[PDB]
Each structure stands twice: as structure tokens, then as C-alpha cells.
Amino acid sequence: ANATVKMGSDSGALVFEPSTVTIKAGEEVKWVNNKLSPHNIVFAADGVDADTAAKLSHKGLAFAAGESFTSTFTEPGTYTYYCEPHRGAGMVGKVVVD
């Protein structure tokens, strides 16, 4: 099914919820802008292919509150996307396609 993850929290904390999402194999996923920007989204091939996690990865950023991203969960694997600017602070997410 369609999944939704926010690059933060509706309060004032940089977190990734749901930290883990499970959808079908072929569906997509939409993200949402939050606080503690910018909030990048890079899917480091962690169990899945590169090129795959590539299109799934987002080497961009987030500044405007309203912009969202999309990711194809076709290939069944495990994609791990974390904060580029905070790739070593305590902000990461896990994906699971079935």
C-alpha cells in the first residue's frame, strides 16, 4: 500500500517516523517536509542494489514547507535513508518492501 514518512516530527524534533514502513512490492512512498531543515534523504544501498536505491535516493534538500518526494518500492529489499547533513547525529529510517 501507499506509505508516508515525515522527515521530522510534528513538534520540534528531528526524527524519522515511521522509522519503519512496510508496503507491497510495486507501490510508491511519499515524504513530507518538516522542521530542522534542511532535511535531505539519501538511500544508502543497505541490502538493496545501488542503481535501485539510487532512483530511490534523493540527493536534494528541503527548505520550503510543502515540498515532498517520491520513491518506488518495486524491487523487494531494504532501503535505508538517512539525513545527509545529519548522517551521523541520530536521524535515519528503514524501509521494507514485500
Calpha distance 93→45 (Å, rounded)? 13
86 marked as binding residue:
yes
In the shown chain, the binding pattern of residues 63 to 92 toward Cu ion, with x for contact by CB under 5 A and - for none, equals --------------------x--x----x-
Q: How far is the CB of 64 from Cu ion (least distance, A)?
A: 15
Query: Is 7 noted as a catalytic residue in this protein?
Result: no
Rule CB under 5 A: is residue 35 a binding residue for Cu ion? no
Does 39 contact Cu ion by CB under 5 A?
A: yes
Residue list for the binding site for Cu cation: 39, 83, 86, 91
Give the binding site for Cu ion (CB under 5 A): 14, 39, 83, 86, 91
